[PDB]
Design a protein around this ligand. Structure first.
Ligand code: HEM
Ligand SMILES: O=S([O-])[O-]
Length: 123
């Protein structure tokens, strides 16, 4: 039911979040969206993205998502291409960790949920 059950406990979740953070950090498509934020904050974001994706959606109200990403949309040019890149990066990380493909699809449908994409992009 929770993230730690899905992935096999606290080490495993740390592994997932660290790998995801590392991949986004190296991704020239999206790294500039975090340029005005420190490294702990960037990590906390990848944790939040992953947590959401695994189905702790309820922590993140769409109204809060709209507001949280508004400056990205208005000031950094955030668009659907960038959105898809973060989601892609998560799935690549999970695949590298050995996460079963059925779990990967579950999380991909949540991470790329049209309602969430609309909120994040302020559409
Ligand atoms: C998609 C699954 C998605 C969610 C969920 C999400 C959450 C989220 C929250 C809760 C914050 C607020 C953090 C705070 O402490 O104020 C937040 C912040 C930022 N996000 Fe995000 N976010 C999701 C998706 C995306 C995507 C696709 C991008 C693309 C670059 C992105 C970016 C950012 C940025 C930048 C911030 C602000 C900096 C930060 O505080 O981390 N998010 N997001
Ligand atoms: O231990 S938490 O900051 O991923």
């Amino acid at each position: 039911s929770t993230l730690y059950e899905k992935l096999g406990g606290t080490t495993a979740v740390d592994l997932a979040v660290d790998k995801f953070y590392e991949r986004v950090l190296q991704d020239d498509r999206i790294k500039h969206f975090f340029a005005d934020v420190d490294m702990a904050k960037q990590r906390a974001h990848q944790k939040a993205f992953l947590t959401y994706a695994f189905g702790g959606t309820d922590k993140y109200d769409g109204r809060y998502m709209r507001e949280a990403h508004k400056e990205l949309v208005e000031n950094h040019g955030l668009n659907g291409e960038h959105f898809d890149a973060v989601a892609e990066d998560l799935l690549a990380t999970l695949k590298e960790m050995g996460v079963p493909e059925d779990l990967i699809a579950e999380v991909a449908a949540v991470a790329g949920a049209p309602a969430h994409k609309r909120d994040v992009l302020n559409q």
